């Protein structure tokens, strides 16, 4: 199938994941950022470009201002998005996006103008023969290898759930939540100031993100952990900064991820992640709820904290009735489960009849996308 | 007689009963329902059919809308009936309906178009060599082993009686009644709302039907039972739903089956089951009434409530004169007595001359059925 | 009759309506909500209470979480209900509920524990000399001035019908439906997200409710309206939210009220409002159906959409036979017809003998209500 | 004669006929029914009575249960009969039954207790100065204007014949028959079910009675009519029910009245109407039979079917010898011939000496009636 070799490209709120259908791991993973210089140059003939995309911006991050083209899964800057797509197709995968149909992903309940503009850029700036837009949670269930269960996806901008029974989706039970990794990073920056550490710039935000994902964990019991931390001092680890200085973090290690289960720490009116998952189940039919309780799939980077699965099981068992058995299925490769399911779907023989052709778009205007792709 | 092996197939308002002549129990019993999907599928290549018949629909009943092809013993949907017959003949009995003559049953006082269409489907869609239509109450008396007595049959849609003296039927004394299991199920659903339990969907109707047939009974004295139930609390049982919740039922246990003897609870103008049985006897000749009083046969699923026979004896003795002796004959296998009598009749040597041939139908149009079969 | 001056107090799923018998309009109408603070106070001596009831909660709705004490006509919080009753009797009507008998209303087919607890609170917390519970649909027919016809009532939680012939009720024909204003509000919130507007909090729900009741209408023909809306742009209106921002609504103006006639939009198994009204008529006797077809009374807030009466007439004429004449009677004051009928009934001279006395709930108890009041 | 103004009141099994002697037509004709409410009233002060008599019951027949006080010419309910007599004397004729002697009618071969109780009610509850009981068939011959011939009377409960020669009655030749309009109505209801129309309630019985008397007729040759009806479709008429529906009747138009000549359709052992009339003639003397063959008088409502006279002539000619001439005398006003003859008899000058006085009853107990009035 080289001819098609569907270039499976995912663009998560925080990262970009591209590759080829049939493989078991993404070829390219890099941050979705665009940087621009903020000082005046004195060296002449240095070959200073006007923009840097991806890992190059993270390297020389001390002299640029970094901007995220995507906020909360909604595009706000379209010039920056075109720059990122050009980087992925030419300088990273080094392929020609004119003979490979492309499969894209999108969160549920997005504005319709998003998919209209996605199709227009792909068919006009590039000449891709076909395209299809799929819900990211459905692709996660493909990777899990099962056709029954409620899926949780939490990336960098959005958190959504969708339960589907024997291949049948219940669109009235889909719930969305605007709590993800970026809110946790801002909260950790705010609460690190009690010990005297002040991080304000965008470059300092990247430093704080690294600290969070290497030293934080979810506590099984929140109140009891505080008493142990207050009494002794064994719950302390040291981190060295990019310039060589040392910081020590105590109860902030588990106080930051706790915001997922108690959103009132940030002052937003919303339910916790455990209650949202339970609320989606209770919106389904009576006769299918038992199979949903025993098939729960976790996905996304924000679900990779240590000890999250045990805490989730404890909370849901307290909510659900005693007789039912609750099982949380968190495979070790759940960080890339969305991409894995996309490759499997594009390699199916029966899927080849649902591509959107170039001819159909030319005759009927850029709306076919809303009715098509289900 | 394998050659004939009459495929004895009964199609009661609620259930379907098929098998072979000469056996003592039906081979296949399953609900007479057809289900169709009501959501939109997202999983591809799942092998999702467009219709489910029988036990398959009851399994996955949480995503379909269930329809009954038969209401009150009168056919309303003919495509669904053809689907059910195809299921029984091929996927359940796994026989070829081309060399076995078929015996069907029908309630008295039905529209004539019913038997005309039954014959046309059997002779055109299938190629059955012969067929015969028998009254279900007559077959019940065959199973009882006697040729004198008044038979009561109450299934899911209709209730009828027919008294026959020494092999002679009195067609002027046949009485019909539109009160059966479905009316009781609707009444129980309506009266369960006083305690806060709300069942509305068709799937919830199946749940309510199971509750009714496992926890309900007929009270010997209606007024006295209410005083005992009001005073104490020993008349209470617990039931667990399909999803782990628990309901408690008090006086609703015996208030639901009571509607058979007092039809005014549903607001319909009609007599009770005891008065209907007595009314049929008084329409017969004087000299045969004494043998009818001492030979009463009960049949059908709705007559399977505990304590129904004792209550029936008490009511009829109060109506009939003191000198006569009233005996109610309710064998333990009366749930299948209609099917049992059909097998016995089809295995009789003297019955083989009354089959309707294929040749007679072809020459004389589909009306022979009305004059034939008595 | 000042002495009695029956305090006519109605408590609809969404609003509360109180006043005095003999008047032509309710004195007090205000939302049935209770609010509680959700932030921590820093100003000292501000006189900050712990709860707000009614219009005070709607004023300062930006810092509280609002809860509805009534869901689907069934009480769930009893402390909040006592708070609301205290507000109405003292701070709004400014009367003493000890010398005026009180008339309350209730939807049919409610749990019996509801009226038991209503009587206990009124006779113990307050010392009201007498009380009576009436069906809201019967009171609506009193206001219409006629004693023949089928009444439709649709408020905020329930929709019910009850046909009554010459003062005789047919309790076997009463039908209930759980589709009202709250389901429409949730659906409009869900379907407003396609244009990018996201309302999630409870305060944002009140904003969405105002938009719905000032810019929505029922289309005479659903399919044809979509073609006109797709082609031109004249079907668009602007609304200005509380911070100065403006939103534009297109086909969502008539897509929201359409859910009443096609309940499958919300994914619930039920019939439309037109089919429910027709189904109730066909459950009545043959000889009284002709007078019911020409006497149809609409009531409740949800029936106040523009163009609802014309659409209802078209649907029922297509269902009913051609010879009958269908007339829909929708008076301009049908928003308060339930309250109007209650005042008329309490002012009748022949009604004074059916009050429930105080000595009877001390010689009988709070169950007298089930047998009494019909 | 105003003073006497004999209030000629007839009470046929089905209808009541009252008026004044000397007139040529009854003043009041209305059904002999009593209705009672069967539902519970909610409207207060509606002036709902506990019983309705006559045309008022037929108007509001959709909410009552109707009972006939008379079955087969024998009184069974005496409270209902007193109610009907009170209605006729006060609310319809508006006269005082204390100064007008009353003439009543009765079928032959009734129980003696009937006339004993009739006299007691009239002399005690009312104070009528005089009474007389006459055979209805004798009064029919008075209206015909002849004193020779055999009279046939068929009303709603009984059919009787009595031949009288030159003013001399032959009481040994009187024959009675229990086949009248009510049996025909029940048979039509039973045989209408073959086309799918189900009428069961008492109100539905009145609908069926109207259909029978407006679309039924007697066929001259029964077998030949069936062949014509089977072949073509011109023998079909349409009728519109009260709620808008439309029913079509084919061979049931003449199959219902045929039961008069072939009583075996209802399964009763009896002779046909033609054979009963012939049997009465053959029980008379030889020398008076010739004048009886040429003087046959028909009377009653059941004899009003079209084509009955021609069929009767054909059957009797086949039975009687060829030389005799058979003439059937059916005047156009034979529906009221019994009442007409009663007025003529009460206006005769020579009849005034045969009244039963009030004084004779007081001295000699209520038996004088059996020996008196012949
Ligand atoms: N080891 C880890 N521990 C905790 N959080 C992590 C870890 N690795 C990644 N994350 C979180 O996952 C997020 C990245 O999600 P990503 O896979 O980019 O989602 P998407 O591709 O949909 O944008 C980061 O914001 C980071 O906070
Ligand atoms: N154990 C039981 N207790 C009470 N009711 C029962 C029981 N078993 C069956 N029934 C009733 O009998 C009905 C089934 O009747 P069925 O035998 O199908 O009649 P038919 O074959 O004529 O349709 C069901 O509707 C059910 O309500
Ligand atoms: N002008 C309007 N247009 C559309 N909907 C309205 C309008 N006015 C009121 N409503 C709806 O009617 C409902 C109020 O019903 P209400 O009269 O309180 O019933 P009840 O008294 O039984 O609670 C509100 O939820 C609102 O959505
Ligand atoms: N036009 C008609 N065709 C057929 N039957 C009729 C017609 N008119 C009246 N009848 C029958 O005659 C009966 C009325 O008989 P009626 O004169 O009341 O006898 P009586 O006065 O002795 O009760 C009704 O039951 C009805 O069935
Ligand atoms: Mg993700
Ligand atoms: Mg049965
Ligand atoms: Mg209302
Ligand atoms: Mg008569």
Numbering used by the authors:
A (entry chain A), B (entry chain C), C (entry chain B), D (entry chain D): 1 to 374
From the reporting publication:
Actin isoforms share high sequence identity at the protein level (~93–99%) and the propensity to self-assemble into helical, polarized filaments (F-actin) from monomers. To determine the structural characteristics and differences between actin isoforms, we solved the high-resolution structures of single-isotype skeletal muscle α-actin (3.37 Å), cardiac muscle α-actin (3.07 Å), ß-actin (2.99 Å), and γ-actin (3.38 Å) in the filamentous state using cryo-EM. Our 2.99–3.38 Å resolution structures of filamentous actin isoforms show that the N-termini of bare muscle and nonmuscle actins have different orientations that contribute to distinct binding interfaces for myosin motors and likely other ABPs.
Specifically, we used our previously established Pick-ya actin method to recombinantly produce human ß-actin and γ-actin in an engineered Pichia pastoris strain that expresses the human N-acetyl transferase NAA80 and histidine methyl transferase SETD3 to ensure uniform Nt-acetylation and methylation of H72/H73, a conserved PTM profile of vertebrate actins. For ß-actin and γ-actin, we could resolve the entire N-terminus starting from amino acids D1 and E1, respectively. The acetylation site on the N-terminus is exposed on the filament surface and adds an additional negative charge to the already negatively charged N-terminus. Instead, the longer side chain of M15 in nonmuscle actins, located in a loop that protrudes into the nucleotide-binding cleft, acts as an extended lid that flanks the active site and shields the phosphate groups of ADP. The negatively charged N-termini of bare ß-actin and γ-actin are near loop-2, a major element of the actomyosin interface that is rich in positively charged amino acids and variable in length. Furthermore, we observed a cluster of positively charged amino acids (R661, R663, and R664) in loop-2 of NM2C that may interact with either the acetylated N-terminus of ß-actin (D1Ac, D2, and D3) or the acetylated N-terminus of γ-actin (E1Ac, E2, and E3) to stabilize the interface.
